[PDB]
Amino acid sequence: NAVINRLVGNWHRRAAVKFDPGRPDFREDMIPFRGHPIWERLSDETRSRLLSWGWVAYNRNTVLIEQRIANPAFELVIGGAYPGLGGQQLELAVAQAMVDEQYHTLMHINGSAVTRRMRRSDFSDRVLPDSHITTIHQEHLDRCEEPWQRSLTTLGFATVAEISINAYLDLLADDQEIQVVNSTTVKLHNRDEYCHASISGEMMKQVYEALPADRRRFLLEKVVAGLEAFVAPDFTTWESIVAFEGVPGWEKAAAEVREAQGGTHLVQDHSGIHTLLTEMDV
């Protein structure tokens, strides 16, 4: 596989791993409460902290994806959990991507740290619950009865992640209003993920082909579930943020928001998985 081979070859060349208080830390249009009348009752200070919390939450979701979904799938690939893979070159490509994911985790942890330090505030990760994709991943895991199911569940969600994360990162990578440290952090991550999408897509094709029909189907079902979870706004995380900030009447508004905004996608570019599924003839 010459896709894999040269990625392995020039990783050491391309890999990312080798403040204005007047700027917002995040995009207003990615805050669910921004689209509700309660936003008009909020002070400039509260609006600002919601923007900071937004960025912190975005970083947390990304860290949770890398640590709970992506790297664990990569580790299962190297350990031989899936048929149709193997070979030295793939092991090296995946091992490389694991370094990248860990570095992305560090970049996003630092993104939050800079914000905490510069805004002079905690914005603690401990205030945030597990992100929505993390929750749904876990729910599917808990419904599994067999080890092979758990592993296929993780592959499916990871494949979705790796192939869709460019679009999630795109939401901030090109914004020139927000902090440039934030934009630049997201862009640097984005650079690595193009190559992750290729690896992940290739691996998905070959695992799918080598699996028996029952297991193939189970895998696609987890892909579907993953994509739905991945592109959704995280209403639940945003509910934790507004409760912590003591926003008057957040609970009633949050219900109104879920009603009006449920069925919208935070991530609307699904070209990654659309293209993967088209190429696979499924």
State which of positions 149-188 bind Fe ion (CB under 5 A).
162
Q: Which of 203, 242, 240 is nearest to 46 (CA)?
A: 242
Taking contact as CB under 5 A, which single stretch among the options 17-25, 52-60, 179-187, 190-198 is the one that binds Fe ion? 190-198
66 annotated as belonging to a binding site for a ligand: yes
Q: Residue 24: how many CA atoms within 13 Å on its side-chain side?
A: 20
274 annotated as belonging to a binding site for a ligand: no
Phi/psi of residue 145, each to 5°?
Answer: -110, -25
Q: Which is nearer to Fe ion, 27 or 104 (CB)?
A: 104
245 annotated as belonging to a binding site for a ligand: no
Q: Which is nearer to Fe ion, 32 or 201 (CB)?
A: 201
For 120-245, where are the alpha helices, taking DSSP H only?
132-143, 147-173, 180-210, 213-231, 235-244
State which of positions 208-267 bind Fe ion (CB under 5 A).
none
Q: Which is nearer to Fe ion, 166 or 218 (CB)?
A: 166
| 15-19 own/partner pairs: CB under 8 Å, 24+ apart | 15/96, 15/99, 15/100, 15/103, 15/192, 16/100, 16/103, 16/104, 16/107, 16/188, 16/189, 16/191, 16/192, 17/99, 17/100, 17/103, 19/114, 19/118, 19/179, 19/181
Residue 104 in the binding site for Fe ion (CB under 5 A) = yes
Q: Total residues at the site for Fe ion (CB under 5 A)?
A: 4
Q: Which is nearer to Fe ion, 56 or 69 (CB)?
A: 69
State which of positions 43-102 bind Fe ion (CB under 5 A).
101
140 annotated as belonging to a binding site for a ligand: no
Q: Which of 159, 151, 168, 137 is nearest to 275 (CA)?
A: 159
Residue 196 in the binding site for Fe ion (CB under 5 A) = yes
270 annotated as belonging to a binding site for a ligand: no
Residues in touch with Fe ion (CB under 5 A): 101, 104, 162, 196
- Residue ranges at the known binding site: 66, 101, 104, 162, 189, 193, 196
Name the binding residues for Fe cation. Answer: 66, 101, 104, 162, 189, 193, 196
